[PDB]
Design a protein around this ligand. Structure first.
Ligand SMILES: *[C@@H]1O[C@H](CO)[C@@H](O[C@@H]2O[C@H](CO)[C@@H](O[C@@H]3O[C@H](CO[C@H]4O[C@H](CO)[C@@H](O)[C@H](O[C@H]5O[C@H](CO)[C@@H](O)[C@H](O)[C@@H]5O[C@H]5O[C@H](CO)[C@@H](O)[C@H](O)[C@@H]5O)[C@@H]4O)[C@@H](O)[C@H](O[C@H]4O[C@H](CO)[C@@H](O)[C@H](O)[C@@H]4O[C@H]4O[C@H](CO)[C@@H](O)[C@H](O)[C@@H]4O)[C@@H]3O)[C@H](O)[C@H]2NC(C)=O)[C@H](O)[C@H]1NC(C)=O
Ligand SMILES: CCn1ccc2c(OC(C)C)cc(C(=O)N3C[C@@H]4[C@H]5CN(C(=O)c6ccc7[nH]nnc7c6)C[C@H]5[C@@H]4C3)cc21
Ligand SMILES: [Ca+2]
Ligand SMILES: [Cl-]
Ligand code: NA
Ligand code: NA
Ligand code: NA
Ligand SMILES: [Zn+2]
Length: 806
């Protein structure tokens, strides 16, 4: 109940929400059908429109007018935004040459530069170039300020997940807004675009920017606008708030535009009807900047112009129907569209079986336009599994397509020509970022980055300590002129042991064999040197990784590679090696095919054994440093040590051997040498974080050898590829992956073909940031470079996407 009998007189767009049943006058009251009876009349004035005209100049104030052109309007803070242009012969902001803003130029009593977040829904990255002729205000912000060529959204590329990620710095699996529609099985409640359940606080996790600000004594404008409040009134409201006394005035403000998303759905991303919405958004930016210039705040405020996601061509006819695949389609519930989420229609149905649904949806049609996954098998870069609102069965939909349960859902729920939601690396889903103001740099282009990083920077701009989040604080320091955040590298928690030769061959009873008993002071001294670390500077180029948790491990040196060997998990945590451009690939010699050799530096008790692999009929093994890339026949024996062995399903060995035998040398050729660090990952609870030993669900049969859920590799070279990877003076270049360690290749529909036709495609889908690997391993990489720490933070957040140019 709202007793809408109170009044909005002197309360229009009040910042504190008053509690039911008292009537509200805040910018959201319409959304809750809760506004006082005189809210439209007093707060949503429209009379005479939004612009001064010559005949209005110097007028007698009429409080009925939408905005004012009278002599008093500046002191009142309510002039029309073009007042000074029309009436005082000033220029529009967009017509002034840009001039660097070296320091805040703020009025007396401003404690900090205010921040204004100008968010545009569905603003695809390529609109910044493609629409630049019709968007002169936005083009001045972009060219004069700090911009990226695009900013990567989170998955799914839907409105609420991305808006709340911008606000929190968190992945949707962590903030809890994992779609525009959701079912939470614990609450037994549904979140929908229409209706009241979405207003319940229990959906919204983490700590959004407006709460972080308020808790730390920084006042925030209300971020949310009822859809029916016109944009001109939203801008005038912000400009009025900026005129408040010092003690009442917010320091952070948000504007939101439903365009260009609203038209993009109707017309497609580049429909000819899209020019007008882009022109209207640009006019809104012009009103804000003219209004700021009128208040002498246009070289005081930091402005962020940011989108949530892009927009792709999608029409009714490109829909896949589950009724074409499933015999049992009425027993499932699908959340449909540009991603699919499947669960049982009834929890009382004992016949429901996810394995049979996945199989029925796997590689069934030649050009099938979706791929089913259990959520734990989704690419780890999506970080889309650790939330009970994410259904176990997920369908990744190809760009330009939809999935639906039955055809009647599509024509009986055509219209639309655009949509979004697809994989966040898809080029059409990328969006925009520009920052303009005293705290951002001048005429500066920065490389693409992810939207989870922006919460930390907004906290930086307001002097706030961010709540714990998934950004890497410091990684965006290169956007900023001041207020950088300068972190220290984390402290190493476990120091390594450096074992020498401690065991005799006969102490090992591992069931392993090797034809290596074939036999010199010249050469013998040289091999002892290699085992003591004499080639380590060639193969460990950026320092050893730091281990950030408590464990027991050994560093092991060899001619061609260095590793950090875990006594607890019985395999390397990491193996590091450098392959120059001139390196030659060789075969595994016949006499060594089944060779595994005890490592006399490491106890039998801390080693794997071959008999376990012989007994486990599903499990084989591979090697982290590949025998194919040995530097000499004698060095190749090191590659067959038991301490270089890892458990691998035969299906996965197809992938790994092609990577090792073919792709590593191809990358070294292409990049002028590469340094490779590879290793296992254990994430049985799919939380994106390193498992402890008691979280491991699968072991090589009969043994204590844990089975990895994934295998990673980090591939680093010199950004200036005229310098070899091992002799690089400047910035680095990286690409990485996290491959799922699966007992079949069902994910790859062409896997019956030669690995040259499918493996690299798999690896691109599972591209990763170094930072993703850090979370999954508890390791910290690039500890010893000659580069600035913030530059290394940016490197660790890089994702190689393999998409063509935006
Ligand atoms: C991305 O950044 C984020 C933020 O840094 C990272 O997320 C953090 O990860 C931490 C480790 O997983 C996690 O720490 C846990 O916190 C528990 C207390 O949490 C509550 O309070 C905090 C603080 O206000 C709050 O933020 C939490 O909010 C979560 O839950 C509510 C309700 O579900 C949601 O609305 C909200 O969205 C958020 O959910 C998300 O996280 C939870 C996990 O908390 C997931 O389950 C959800 O799916 C969703 O992803 C909470 O309100 C605390 O209880 C945990 O402690 C257990 O484990 C420790 C080990 O240190 C042990 O010592 C403790 O005793 C305890 O064990 C006991 O509980 C076990 C489980 O019940 C039980 O088995 C044992 O026997 C014991 O009884 C733990 O410390 C932190 O909460 C989240 N924060 C957020 C916001 O998500 C995230 O990891 C980063 N991602 C990557 C990839 O790097
Ligand atoms: C900078 C502004 N800003 C930052 C966070 C934030 C926000 O966070 C909440 C999620 C708590 C909400 C806001 C905020 O005011 N809103 C108002 C609108 C809500 C209703 N929507 C829809 O009808 C909708 C729109 C496009 C779609 N495409 N495909 N399907 C779609 C369904 C989504 C939400 C939009 C954002 C603005 C916000
Ligand atoms: Ca884990
Ligand atoms: Cl109302
Ligand atoms: Na053997
Ligand atoms: Na086996
Ligand atoms: Na296959
Ligand atoms: Zn939309």
């Amino acid at each position: 109940w709202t007793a809408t009998s109170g009044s909005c007189k002197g309360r229009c767009f009040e910042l504190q929400e008053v509690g039911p049943p008292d009537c509200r006058c805040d910018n959201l009251c319409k959304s809750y059908s809760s506004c006082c009876h005189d809210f439209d009349e007093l707060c949503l004035k429209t009379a005479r429109g939004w612009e001064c005209t010559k005949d209005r100049c110097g007028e007698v104030r009429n409080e009925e007018n939408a905005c004012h052109c009278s002599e008093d309007c500046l002191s009142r803070g309510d002039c029309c935004t073009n007042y000074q242009v029309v009436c005082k012969g000033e220029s529009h902001w967009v017509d002034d040459d840009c001039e660097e803003i070296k320091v805040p130029e703020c009025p007396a009593g401003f404690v900090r530069p205010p921040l204004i977040i100008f968010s545009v829904d569905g603003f695809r990255a390529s609109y910044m170039k493609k629409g630049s002729k019709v968007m002169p205000n936005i083009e001045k912000l972009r060219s004069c300020g700090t911009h990226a060529p695009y900013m990567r959204p989170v998955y799914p590329t839907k409105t609420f997940p991305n808006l709340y990620t911008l606000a929190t710095g968190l992945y949707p699996e962590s903030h809890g807004i994992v779609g525009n529609s959701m079912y939470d099985p614990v609450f037994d409640a549904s979140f929908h675009l229409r209706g009241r359940e979405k207003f319940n606080h229990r959906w919204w996790g983490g700590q959004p920017l407006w709460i972080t600000a308020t808790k730390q004594g920084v006042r925030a404008g209300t971020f949310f606008w009822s859809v029916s409040i016109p944009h001109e009134r939203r801008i005038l409201t912000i400009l009025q708030w900026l005129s408040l006394p010092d003690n009442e005035r917010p320091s952070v403000y948000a504007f939101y535009s439903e365009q260009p998303d609203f038209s993009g759905h109707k017309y497609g991303p580049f429909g000819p009807e899209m020019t007008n919405p882009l022109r209207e958004i640009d006019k809104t930016v012009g009103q804000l900047m003219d209004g700021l210039k009128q208040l002498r705040l246009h070289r005081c405020v930091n402005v962020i112009f940011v989108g949530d996601h892009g927009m792709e061509d999608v029409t009714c006819d490109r829909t896949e129907f589950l009724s074409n695949y499933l015999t049992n389609v009425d027993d499932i519930t699908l959340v449909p569209g540009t991603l699919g989420r499947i669960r049982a229609k009834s929890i009382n149905n004992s016949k429901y079986d996810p394995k049979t649904i996945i199989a029925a949806l796997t590689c069934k049609k030649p050009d099938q336009h979706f791929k089913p996954y259990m959520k734990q098998h989704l690419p780890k870069r999506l970080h889309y599994a650790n939330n009970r609102r994410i259904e176990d069965i997920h369908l990744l939909v190809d760009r330009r397509w939809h999935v639906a349960r039955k055809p009647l859902d599509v024509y009986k729920k055509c219209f639309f020509q655009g949509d979004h939601g697809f994989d966040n690396k898809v080029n059409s889903m990328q969006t925009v970022f520009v920052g303009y103001g005293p705290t951002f740099k001048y005429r500066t282009k920065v490389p693409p980055f992810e939207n989870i990083e922006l919460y930390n920077v907004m906290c930086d701009l307001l002097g706030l300590k961010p709540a714990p989040n998934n950004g890497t604080h410091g990684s965006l320091n290169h956007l900023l002129r001041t207020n950088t955040f300068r972190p220290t590298m984390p402290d190493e928690v476990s120091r390594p042991n450096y074992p020498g030769i401690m065991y005799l061959q006969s102490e090992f009873d591992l069931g392993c064999t090797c034809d290596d008993k074939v036999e010199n002071k010249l050469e013998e001294l040289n091999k002892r040197l290699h085992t003591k670390g004499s080639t380590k500077e060639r193969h460990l180029l950026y320092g050893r990784p730091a281990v950030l948790y408590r464990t027991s491990y050994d560093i092991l040196y060899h001619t061609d590679f260095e590793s950090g060997y875990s006594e607890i998990f019985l395999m390397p945590l990491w193996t590091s090696y450098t392959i120059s451009k001139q390196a030659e690939v060789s075969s595994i010699p016949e006499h060594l095919t089944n060779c595994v050799r005890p490592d006399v530096r490491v106890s039998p008790g801390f080693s794997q054994n071959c008999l376990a692999y012989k007994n486990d009929k599903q499990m084989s093994y591979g090697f982290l440093f590949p025998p194919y890339l040995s530097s000499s026949p004698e060095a190749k024996y090191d590659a067959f040590l038991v301490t270089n062995m890892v458990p691998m399903y035969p299906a996965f060995k197809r992938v790994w051997a092609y990577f090792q035998r073919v792709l590593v040398k191809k990358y070294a050729s292409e990049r002028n040498g590469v340094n490779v660090i590879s290793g296992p990952i254990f994430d049985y609870n799919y939380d994106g974080l390193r498992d402890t030993e008691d979280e491991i669900k699968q072991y090589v049969e009969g043994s204590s050898i844990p089975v990895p859920t994934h295998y990673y590799s980090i591939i680093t070279s010199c950004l200036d590829f005229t310098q070899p990877a091992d002799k690089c003076d400047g910035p680095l270049s990286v690409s990485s992956f996290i491959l799922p360690h699966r007992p079949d290749n069902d994910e790859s529909c062409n896997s019956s073909e030669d690995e040259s036709k499918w493996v690299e495609e798999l690896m691109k889908m599972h591209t990763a940031r170094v930072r993703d690997i850090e979370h999954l391993t508890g390791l910290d990489f690039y500890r010893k470079t000659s580069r600035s720490y913030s530059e290394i933070l940016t490197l660790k957040t890089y994702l190689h996407t393999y998409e063509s140019e935006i």
